[PDB]
Amino acid sequence: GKVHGSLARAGKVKSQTPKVEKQEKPKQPKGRAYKRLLYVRRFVNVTNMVGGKRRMNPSS
Template identity: 55%
Template sequence: MGKVHGSMARAGKVRNQAPKVDKTERAKKRVAGRAKKRLQYKKRIVNVDPNDKRKKGPNFGAGKKVVVAP
């Protein structure tokens, strides 16, 4: 049998030659599956104010238009 891989003297050669790159900040992953259903349940059932007469939609408060008086 011949030599299968390189000798231990060359171990880590490529990794040590590569330039060091800092990790980038990434946006948080979206919740999926069971956890998403849990969030929906909390948003729709648990956190609803019983004293509020109107049912608020899922897009409530997303950019109310402000009317400026002339």
């Protein structure tokens, strides 16, 4: 509702972000295999215990 705008400044960041490469990864089975795989490692193979945090997205 205001008569004001700089059309040149639109998309300023997108033109200046550097583009990086991606590392190739082997195939990971998906679907029922992924659901079965996560079930097999859901209670036994754990390293985030002692506290009960259960951080499935670790941060450092």
